[PDB]
Amino acid sequence: APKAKIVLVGSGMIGGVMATLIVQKNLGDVVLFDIVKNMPHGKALDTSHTNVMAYSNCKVSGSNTYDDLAGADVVIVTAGFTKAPGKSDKEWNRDDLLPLNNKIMIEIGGHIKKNCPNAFIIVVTNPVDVMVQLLHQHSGVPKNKIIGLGGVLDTSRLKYYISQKLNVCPRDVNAHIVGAHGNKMVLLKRYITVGGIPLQEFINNKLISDAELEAIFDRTVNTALEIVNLHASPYVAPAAAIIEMAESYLKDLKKVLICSTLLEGQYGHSDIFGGTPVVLGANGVEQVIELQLNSEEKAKFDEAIAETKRMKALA
Amino acid sequence: APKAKIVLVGSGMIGGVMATLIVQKNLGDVVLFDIVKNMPHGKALDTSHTNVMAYSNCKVSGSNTYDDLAGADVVIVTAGFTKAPGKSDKEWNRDDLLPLNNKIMIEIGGHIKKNCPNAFIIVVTNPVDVMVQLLHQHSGVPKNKIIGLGGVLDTSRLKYYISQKLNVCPRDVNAHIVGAHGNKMVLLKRYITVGGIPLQEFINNKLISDAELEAIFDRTVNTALEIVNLHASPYVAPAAAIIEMAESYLKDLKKVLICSTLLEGQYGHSDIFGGTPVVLGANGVEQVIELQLNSEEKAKFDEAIAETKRMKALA
Amino acid sequence: APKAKIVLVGSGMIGGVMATLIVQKNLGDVVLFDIVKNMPHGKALDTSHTNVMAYSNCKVSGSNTYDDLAGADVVIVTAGFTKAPGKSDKEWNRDDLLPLNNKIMIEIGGHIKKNCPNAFIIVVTNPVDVMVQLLHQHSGVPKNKIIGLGGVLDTSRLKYYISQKLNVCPRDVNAHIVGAHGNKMVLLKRYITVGGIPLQEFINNKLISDAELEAIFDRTVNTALEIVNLHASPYVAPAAAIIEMAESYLKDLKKVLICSTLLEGQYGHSDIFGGTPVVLGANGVEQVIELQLNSEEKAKFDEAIAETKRMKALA
Amino acid sequence: APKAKIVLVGSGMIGGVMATLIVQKNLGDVVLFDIVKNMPHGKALDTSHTNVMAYSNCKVSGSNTYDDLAGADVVIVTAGFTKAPGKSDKEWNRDDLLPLNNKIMIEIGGHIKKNCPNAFIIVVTNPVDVMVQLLHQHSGVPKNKIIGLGGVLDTSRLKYYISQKLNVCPRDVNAHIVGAHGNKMVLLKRYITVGGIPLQEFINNKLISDAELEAIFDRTVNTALEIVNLHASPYVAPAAAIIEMAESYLKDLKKVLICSTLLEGQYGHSDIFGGTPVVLGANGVEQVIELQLNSEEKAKFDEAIAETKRMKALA
Ligand SMILES: CC(=O)C1=CN([C@@H]2O[C@H](COP(=O)(O)OP(=O)(O)OC[C@H]3O[C@@H](n4cnc5c(N)ncnc54)[C@H](O)[C@@H]3O)[C@@H](O)[C@H]2O)C=CC1
Ligand SMILES: CC(=O)C1=CN([C@@H]2O[C@H](COP(=O)(O)OP(=O)(O)OC[C@H]3O[C@@H](n4cnc5c(N)ncnc54)[C@H](O)[C@@H]3O)[C@@H](O)[C@H]2O)C=CC1
Ligand SMILES: CC(=O)C1=CN([C@@H]2O[C@H](COP(=O)(O)OP(=O)(O)OC[C@H]3O[C@@H](n4cnc5c(N)ncnc54)[C@H](O)[C@@H]3O)[C@@H](O)[C@H]2O)C=CC1
Ligand SMILES: CC(=O)C1=CN([C@@H]2O[C@H](COP(=O)(O)OP(=O)(O)OC[C@H]3O[C@@H](n4cnc5c(N)ncnc54)[C@H](O)[C@@H]3O)[C@@H](O)[C@H]2O)C=CC1
C-alpha cells in the first residue's frame, strides 16, 4: 500500500506513546521494534485495537527482527539506556553510557543503510546531538534526511510555562532554544513572542517580570530532572514532539521546528549537529534557518557545541 | 471556567494514557489523582507540555488530595490492584483482591458523595461489573450517572480482528459483547455486521469462515491474557475506550456504546450491573438498550450475571 | 511533492465546498477547474487563506486549462447542468440535458485519458449512474479506478432522519440504498441498524413505527426536491459525501461506502454501473460487495437499473 | 442540553460556510436565521446530513423568527447588504448602505437584548468597526461580550502570501493588522515573524525583499477587491476566521486573535471600536492587548479610527 511505514526502533516508554499517537492521527502503519522479546508484540496488539476508537486504519505490529526496517519511510530511534545503572535520580547526567549508546547507533546505522537507505530518520537516544551525528555517519543517509529531537520538546516547556503565567493559549507562545539539547541548551529571551508580539512588551507592561522569566528559564532547563524527582519520567511530551516532527515530514506541512541538524557554517560551526530551526517537509530538512544571534547569544551557542564535541570524543 | 473538570482517580498506566488523550482532544482540564506521592505531579507535568504540540488548552495537574474531587464533572476510577501479588502471569483471574478493591471503591465513593455528587462516573477497576455497583452504592449517584468500562473495549478487539481478516476499516465492523467484562463475556455472533451488512453474508461468500470466527471469538475473550503473556499489559486500548465514553458524555454525542449499567429488568435481571448497549449523552445514560436475545444467548447472559454475583458476595 | 493533487473538474457549488473541506482536512493540493473565466481563481484565492485557520498546507489554485489535469491523483467531476433551463423547481427530473452532459463527460474523458490516466475518478454529474459509465468508457481508466456518488449521500439522509427520531448519534445509524441515485433508489429496510442492532428491534419496542419509517423513506427519496422547494440547493452534503469517498482512497481507510460501480454479474447485472457497497482504499475499489437481496428487493434493484439504461440510451 | 446554541443571524454565503464548519468541528447546535423565507430551512436541511460524514451530533435548523435567538450562547451577525445596488464591482466601497445596515444592527440589537443578553456576539456586517459598536450600543451587552471580525481574516491573507514566498507552513507566519478592517487597515511590518523569528532576518538573507513585501502588503489590503474582480466573492475565509474566534470562546482556548473591540485608552483612543489583538476565552474578551506602536505606526492607526468615526457619523 501507499500508507507510510513508520518503524519505531525502540519500543519503550516513548515508543509506546508514539505508536498511540500515530494511530490517533492515522499517520501510517507502525512497527514497534525492540531487542526485548515479545514485549513489542504485546504493546502493538494493545495499540492496534485503538484503530476502532480512532476511526483509523493503521497496522501496528511488533518486531524482534532488524530486517523489518525494510521499506521504512520513517525510522524513529529511541533505542538505548535512559539512565546510568548505578547513578541516583538526583545525579542524572552524561559521561559513561556514551560508548554503549554509540554501539547501539552503529548497529542500527548498519541496518538502516542495508534495509531503508531512503528513509527519513529521527534520533532521540541521548545525548541526542551526539547520537544523531553518529547515526548519520553509520547509516550513510543524506544530511537532509536525519534530524535529532530537541528544540520542539525544550521549547514546548518554555512556551507552556509562559502561557500559564500570561493566561494565553500555549501554542500562541513562540520561543527558540538552540545549540544542544541538555544542560547547555541556549534559551533565547530575545526571540520569545506571545501571539506574535515581542515578549518584551509584556515585560514592559508588568504582565510578566524579568525575574519570573529567569525562573521559568531555569525550570525549562531542569524540567527532565524535575519530572524524575517527582517519581515520573519524561516520555509523553517527547513522544508528542517527535510525532509533530514526523507528521510535518509525512504531510509536507513545512513547519518551522527546532531540531538537531548538520551545521555547515551556521553560527560559525561545521562538521557537527546542533539545534536550530529547520523547515520539515516532503524533502526532509528543506531549509536550515540560521538565527542572526548577537555575540552574547553566540557565546552560549559555542558552549553548547563544545559540550557535544566533548561527549562525541568519549563515544 | 466552563471547561469540564475531569478527575482521574488512579494515575497508573491507564490514567496516563487517558490524560494524554484528553489533551490531544482538548476535552477538559485534568487532575491525575493517586495515593502514590509525587508521581501524579510528574506525569501531569510531562503531559501538560503536550498542549503546545496539540493546539490545546487543558490544564493537567497532579493531586494526592481526595478533596480535589470537588467540582469534578467527570470522574474516572482506575484505582486498585491489577493483579494478585503472588499469582503468575499464566494464572491471571478473580477471587481474593475483591475485598481490597471493595475498600478502595468504598473510600472513593465517600469522597465522591461529599465532593462531586453530580459528576458522571466511569469505573474501570476490576472486576468492573462488581466494582461499578459497589461504587454506585457508596457514592450515592443516580443510576444514569455511573457506568463501567467493558463492551467498548471487548468489542474493539472483536471488531479489529474481523476487520483485519476482511480488509475493511476497523470502525466498519460492528459487534456486541454483553453481560459482563471478563471470561464470561457474551459474544453475540448474530449481532455482527460489516459496513452495516450481516456478517453471515460474508460467511456465505466464504470470505470468512465459521471456524475462523470461532478462533477470533476465543482470541477476543483471551486478549488481556495474550498481551500479558507477551510481556506487555493492556492499557492503551482500555484508555481509548474510556475516553470514547467520556467524550460522548461531554460532547452530547449520544453514541451507542456497550457499558456496564444498572439493569432494571432487562434480560430478566434486576439489582445488578451488566454490559449492554447504552446511549451516552449530556444526561449521562440516556437510554438502556435491551437486545432481543434468543434463549441460547440469554442463557450465556445469565452465566455472566451469575459470575458477577458470585464475586460481589466475596467482596 | 508527494502531496496528492486533487483536481475538481467543475468549480460550482459542490466544488467550492469540496475545496473548503480538503483544506480543513489537509488532504492534498487542489485545483478548481472550470470553463467559467476567472471564477475558479477567485474561489481558490478565498479558500487558500483558510490554510492559516486550519493549520494546513494545501495549495488551492484555479484553472481554466484542461491540461492542468496532468499529474492528478484524484479527479472529481461535478461539471455540467444542474437543472433543465426552462423547467420549474416543482418539476425537477431527467430526459433532455442528457446529450449535453454526455458531451461534457466525453470531453473530460479525453482529457483524463491524455493527462492523468492513472488518477482515481469520482463522478457526480447527474444522472450520475449514467454519466459515470460514460466517463469510464471515454477516459479508458480501469473499473477499479472510477466510481459515482450516490449511496453515501442518500444514506446520510436516511441515517440522519432515523437518528433524530431515536435520539442517537447520526453515525450510529447504518443503512443501505442501492441500485441507482435518483427517484428509483432502492431503500433496504432489512439492512438498517442502530448501534449495530437491527432496526426491527426498535420497531418491536415501539421506539419508531413502520409508518414513521415509511415517511422517512419517502423523505429520503425526495430530499433534493425538498431542499429545492425551500429555496436552497443540495451541495454541502453532496460535497461532504464525496470527500468521505476521496479521503478513504487517499488514506487507504478501506471504508465500506455505497457508490456507483461497474457491475459484473452482481444482482444479475452486467455492463452497467449501479449503486452497491464497495471498499475504497489505496487500490481504488478494492472490493465490490454484493448484498444478498431477496426477490422483492432484487425486483426494485432491477427497476433502478432499467431507468439507468433508459437514460443511457437517450444520452 | 448543555451543547452550545449558536445562532447565525444572516444565512447567506458566510452563514452557510459557518454552519458547515460548525458541524465539521461539532461545536454546537446551529440556527440559520434569515429574513428570506424558506432558504435557511433548505440550507439547514442540506447541512444537517453532514453530521453523518463528520461523526458529529449538532442540530442544524433554519429560522425566520427573531425569537429563536432565545437561549443563544453565541450570536454571529452577517445580516446586511454586501454591495451597493448600483455600484460596479470595480468601485466597491463605503458611503450610502450605512443607514440601512445601521437599521439592521438596531433591529438585531433589540432582539438580542430581549432574548439572549448573555450571549457572546461576533459582528461581521460591513463596515464592521462601525456596525459592531452600533450593535454593542443597541444590544446592551457588556464590552467583553461583543467583537468584530477583521484582523484574523486580514492577517490570514498576509500570513498566507508570505508563507507561499518563503515555503513554510502558513500558520508559522504571524502578523498584525490593526486599527480597522477596510482600506485603512494598518499593516505592521515590524510585527511579522516566521516560525517566531523576525521577518527582518529573512529580508537580510535576501529570502524575501522589501519590495516583495510592499507588493504583498498592497495585495493584502486589496484582496477582497481582487476576489470580486475574479468573479468570485470572499466568504470561505471570512467564515473560517469567524469560526476560529467562536471556537476560542466556546472551548476556552485563550487564543490571541486580532478583533474589533471597544478601546478604552489604548493607542490614545476611547469610545470607539478598533482592531487589536485580544485574548478570547470563556469570559469573552479576557484581555485587550495594546501593541507598543511607534509614532509612525500610531499615525496610521489614527487614520483608521478617523475613517470609522467618519462612517459612524453617516450611519
Ligand atoms: C532528546 C530528548 O529530548 C529525549 C531523549 N530521551 C532518550 O530517549 C531514549 C528512550 O527513552 P524511553 O523513556 O523510551 O526509554 P525506555 O528505556 O523505556 O526505552 C528504550 C528502549 O530501547 C530498547 N533498546 C535497547 N537497545 C535496542 C536496540 N539495539 N534496538 C531497538 N531497541 C533497543 C530497550 O529494550 C527499551 O525498550 C533514552 O536514551 C532517553 O534518554 C528521552 C527523553 C527526551
Ligand atoms: C474493565 C476493563 O476493561 C479493564 C480494567 N482494568 C483495571 O483497571 C485498573 C487499572 O489498571 P492500570 O493498568 O492503570 O493499573 P496501574 O496499577 O498502573 O494503576 C492503578 C493505580 O491505582 C492507584 N491507586 C491505588 N489505590 C488508590 C486510591 N485509593 N485512589 C487513587 N489511586 C489509587 C495505584 O497507586 C496505581 O497508580 C486495574 O484494576 C485493572 O484490572 C484494566 C484493563 C481493562
Ligand atoms: C450524484 C449526486 O448525489 C448529486 C449530483 N449533483 C450534480 O452535480 C452537478 C454539480 O452540482 P453543483 O451544485 O456544483 O452545480 P453548479 O452549477 O454550481 O456547478 C457546475 C459547474 O460545472 C461547470 N462546468 C460546465 N461545463 C464544464 C466543463 N466542461 N468542465 C469543467 N466545468 C464545467 C459550470 O460552469 C459550473 O460552475 C450537477 O450535475 C448536479 O445535478 C448534485 C447533487 C447531488
Ligand atoms: C468584516 C469582514 O472581514 C467581512 C465582512 N463581510 C460582510 O458580511 C456581510 C455578509 O456577507 P455574505 O457574503 O454572507 O452576504 P450575503 O448577502 O450572502 O448574506 C447576507 C444575508 O443577510 C440577510 N439579511 C438581511 N437582513 C437581515 C436581518 N435583518 N436578519 C437576518 N438576516 C438578514 C440577507 O437576506 C442575506 O441572506 C456583508 O455585510 C459583508 O460586507 C464580508 C466579508 C468580510
PDB file of N, CA, C and O in Angstrom, chain D residues 218-247:
ATOM      1  N   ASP D 218       0.146  45.484  -0.361  1.00  0.00           N
ATOM      2  CA  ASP D 218      -0.913  46.029  -1.186  1.00  0.00           C
ATOM      3  C   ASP D 218      -1.899  44.925  -1.564  1.00  0.00           C
ATOM      4  O   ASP D 218      -3.099  45.138  -1.617  1.00  0.00           O
ATOM      5  N   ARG D 219      -1.390  43.728  -1.819  1.00  0.00           N
ATOM      6  CA  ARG D 219      -2.274  42.631  -2.188  1.00  0.00           C
ATOM      7  C   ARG D 219      -3.228  42.295  -1.041  1.00  0.00           C
ATOM      8  O   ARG D 219      -4.399  41.998  -1.258  1.00  0.00           O
ATOM      9  N   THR D 220      -2.705  42.345   0.175  1.00  0.00           N
ATOM     10  CA  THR D 220      -3.484  42.042   1.368  1.00  0.00           C
ATOM     11  C   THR D 220      -4.619  43.050   1.511  1.00  0.00           C
ATOM     12  O   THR D 220      -5.782  42.684   1.697  1.00  0.00           O
ATOM     13  N   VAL D 221      -4.290  44.331   1.421  1.00  0.00           N
ATOM     14  CA  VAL D 221      -5.314  45.356   1.555  1.00  0.00           C
ATOM     15  C   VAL D 221      -6.409  45.194   0.497  1.00  0.00           C
ATOM     16  O   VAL D 221      -7.597  45.334   0.786  1.00  0.00           O
ATOM     17  N   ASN D 222      -5.993  44.881  -0.723  1.00  0.00           N
ATOM     18  CA  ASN D 222      -6.895  44.758  -1.854  1.00  0.00           C
ATOM     19  C   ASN D 222      -7.440  43.366  -2.153  1.00  0.00           C
ATOM     20  O   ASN D 222      -8.040  43.147  -3.203  1.00  0.00           O
ATOM     21  N   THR D 223      -7.270  42.415  -1.248  1.00  0.00           N
ATOM     22  CA  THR D 223      -7.681  41.046  -1.539  1.00  0.00           C
ATOM     23  C   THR D 223      -9.179  40.890  -1.843  1.00  0.00           C
ATOM     24  O   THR D 223      -9.542  40.136  -2.744  1.00  0.00           O
ATOM     25  N   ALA D 224     -10.034  41.551  -1.074  1.00  0.00           N
ATOM     26  CA  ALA D 224     -11.475  41.451  -1.308  1.00  0.00           C
ATOM     27  C   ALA D 224     -11.777  41.902  -2.737  1.00  0.00           C
ATOM     28  O   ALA D 224     -12.512  41.245  -3.464  1.00  0.00           O
ATOM     29  N   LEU D 225     -11.186  43.016  -3.136  1.00  0.00           N
ATOM     30  CA  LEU D 225     -11.372  43.537  -4.492  1.00  0.00           C
ATOM     31  C   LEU D 225     -10.784  42.580  -5.527  1.00  0.00           C
ATOM     32  O   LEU D 225     -11.367  42.356  -6.591  1.00  0.00           O
ATOM     33  N   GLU D 226      -9.630  42.002  -5.245  1.00  0.00           N
ATOM     34  CA  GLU D 226      -9.038  41.031  -6.163  1.00  0.00           C
ATOM     35  C   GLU D 226      -9.995  39.851  -6.423  1.00  0.00           C
ATOM     36  O   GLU D 226     -10.177  39.411  -7.573  1.00  0.00           O
ATOM     37  N   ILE D 227     -10.600  39.336  -5.360  1.00  0.00           N
ATOM     38  CA  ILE D 227     -11.519  38.205  -5.470  1.00  0.00           C
ATOM     39  C   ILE D 227     -12.776  38.595  -6.234  1.00  0.00           C
ATOM     40  O   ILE D 227     -13.212  37.851  -7.131  1.00  0.00           O
ATOM     41  N   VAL D 228     -13.329  39.765  -5.918  1.00  0.00           N
ATOM     42  CA  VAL D 228     -14.506  40.259  -6.641  1.00  0.00           C
ATOM     43  C   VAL D 228     -14.193  40.433  -8.137  1.00  0.00           C
ATOM     44  O   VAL D 228     -15.012  40.069  -9.006  1.00  0.00           O
ATOM     45  N   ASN D 229     -13.014  40.952  -8.463  1.00  0.00           N
ATOM     46  CA  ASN D 229     -12.663  41.171  -9.867  1.00  0.00           C
ATOM     47  C   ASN D 229     -12.446  39.863 -10.636  1.00  0.00           C
ATOM     48  O   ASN D 229     -12.442  39.838 -11.878  1.00  0.00           O
ATOM     49  N   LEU D 230     -12.249  38.776  -9.896  1.00  0.00           N
ATOM     50  CA  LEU D 230     -12.109  37.450 -10.488  1.00  0.00           C
ATOM     51  C   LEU D 230     -13.453  36.737 -10.581  1.00  0.00           C
ATOM     52  O   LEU D 230     -13.506  35.544 -10.839  1.00  0.00           O
ATOM     53  N   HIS D 231     -14.539  37.463 -10.380  1.00  0.00           N
ATOM     54  CA  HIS D 231     -15.891  36.902 -10.484  1.00  0.00           C
ATOM     55  C   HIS D 231     -16.195  35.915  -9.365  1.00  0.00           C
ATOM     56  O   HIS D 231     -16.884  34.920  -9.560  1.00  0.00           O
ATOM     57  N   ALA D 232     -15.677  36.201  -8.192  1.00  0.00           N
ATOM     58  CA  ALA D 232     -15.967  35.385  -7.021  1.00  0.00           C
ATOM     59  C   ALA D 232     -16.328  36.382  -5.907  1.00  0.00           C
ATOM     60  O   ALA D 232     -16.466  37.566  -6.165  1.00  0.00           O
ATOM     61  N   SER D 233     -16.497  35.906  -4.678  1.00  0.00           N
ATOM     62  CA  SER D 233     -16.818  36.772  -3.552  1.00  0.00           C
ATOM     63  C   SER D 233     -16.119  36.151  -2.336  1.00  0.00           C
ATOM     64  O   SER D 233     -16.099  34.924  -2.226  1.00  0.00           O
ATOM     65  N   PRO D 234     -15.517  36.949  -1.457  1.00  0.00           N
ATOM     66  CA  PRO D 234     -14.890  36.396  -0.258  1.00  0.00           C
ATOM     67  C   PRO D 234     -15.909  36.025   0.814  1.00  0.00           C
ATOM     68  O   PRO D 234     -16.541  36.868   1.467  1.00  0.00           O
ATOM     69  N   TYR D 235     -16.025  34.721   1.033  1.00  0.00           N
ATOM     70  CA  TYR D 235     -16.893  34.212   2.082  1.00  0.00           C
ATOM     71  C   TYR D 235     -16.351  32.970   2.801  1.00  0.00           C
ATOM     72  O   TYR D 235     -16.685  32.746   3.965  1.00  0.00           O
ATOM     73  N   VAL D 236     -15.476  32.190   2.164  1.00  0.00           N
ATOM     74  CA  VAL D 236     -14.946  30.998   2.805  1.00  0.00           C
ATOM     75  C   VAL D 236     -13.956  31.382   3.900  1.00  0.00           C
ATOM     76  O   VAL D 236     -14.089  30.922   5.033  1.00  0.00           O
ATOM     77  N   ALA D 237     -12.970  32.221   3.585  1.00  0.00           N
ATOM     78  CA  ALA D 237     -12.013  32.611   4.619  1.00  0.00           C
ATOM     79  C   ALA D 237     -12.672  33.465   5.704  1.00  0.00           C
ATOM     80  O   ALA D 237     -12.372  33.293   6.876  1.00  0.00           O
ATOM     81  N   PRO D 238     -13.537  34.405   5.357  1.00  0.00           N
ATOM     82  CA  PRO D 238     -14.257  35.090   6.427  1.00  0.00           C
ATOM     83  C   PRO D 238     -14.951  34.099   7.377  1.00  0.00           C
ATOM     84  O   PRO D 238     -14.803  34.244   8.597  1.00  0.00           O
ATOM     85  N   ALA D 239     -15.647  33.100   6.842  1.00  0.00           N
ATOM     86  CA  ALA D 239     -16.294  32.108   7.683  1.00  0.00           C
ATOM     87  C   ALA D 239     -15.284  31.372   8.581  1.00  0.00           C
ATOM     88  O   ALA D 239     -15.528  31.197   9.773  1.00  0.00           O
ATOM     89  N   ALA D 240     -14.162  30.923   8.034  1.00  0.00           N
ATOM     90  CA  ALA D 240     -13.193  30.199   8.828  1.00  0.00           C
ATOM     91  C   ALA D 240     -12.618  31.071   9.937  1.00  0.00           C
ATOM     92  O   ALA D 240     -12.389  30.594  11.043  1.00  0.00           O
ATOM     93  N   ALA D 241     -12.366  32.344   9.641  1.00  0.00           N
ATOM     94  CA  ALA D 241     -11.834  33.271  10.636  1.00  0.00           C
ATOM     95  C   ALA D 241     -12.840  33.427  11.766  1.00  0.00           C
ATOM     96  O   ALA D 241     -12.503  33.421  12.944  1.00  0.00           O
ATOM     97  N   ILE D 242     -14.107  33.602  11.415  1.00  0.00           N
ATOM     98  CA  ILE D 242     -15.138  33.751  12.429  1.00  0.00           C
ATOM     99  C   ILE D 242     -15.253  32.521  13.296  1.00  0.00           C
ATOM    100  O   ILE D 242     -15.397  32.620  14.526  1.00  0.00           O
ATOM    101  N   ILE D 243     -15.194  31.351  12.678  1.00  0.00           N
ATOM    102  CA  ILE D 243     -15.276  30.119  13.446  1.00  0.00           C
ATOM    103  C   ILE D 243     -14.045  29.939  14.345  1.00  0.00           C
ATOM    104  O   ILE D 243     -14.155  29.432  15.464  1.00  0.00           O
ATOM    105  N   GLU D 244     -12.880  30.390  13.904  1.00  0.00           N
ATOM    106  CA  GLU D 244     -11.712  30.336  14.788  1.00  0.00           C
ATOM    107  C   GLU D 244     -11.960  31.166  16.039  1.00  0.00           C
ATOM    108  O   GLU D 244     -11.652  30.741  17.165  1.00  0.00           O
ATOM    109  N   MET D 245     -12.587  32.332  15.865  1.00  0.00           N
ATOM    110  CA  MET D 245     -12.902  33.201  17.005  1.00  0.00           C
ATOM    111  C   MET D 245     -13.940  32.542  17.907  1.00  0.00           C
ATOM    112  O   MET D 245     -13.804  32.495  19.130  1.00  0.00           O
ATOM    113  N   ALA D 246     -15.016  32.066  17.314  1.00  0.00           N
ATOM    114  CA  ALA D 246     -16.091  31.454  18.077  1.00  0.00           C
ATOM    115  C   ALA D 246     -15.601  30.226  18.850  1.00  0.00           C
ATOM    116  O   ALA D 246     -15.975  30.024  20.013  1.00  0.00           O
ATOM    117  N   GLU D 247     -14.781  29.401  18.200  1.00  0.00           N
ATOM    118  CA  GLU D 247     -14.226  28.206  18.818  1.00  0.00           C
ATOM    119  C   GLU D 247     -13.340  28.566  20.019  1.00  0.00           C
ATOM    120  O   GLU D 247     -13.376  27.891  21.047  1.00  0.00           O
TER     121      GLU D 247
END
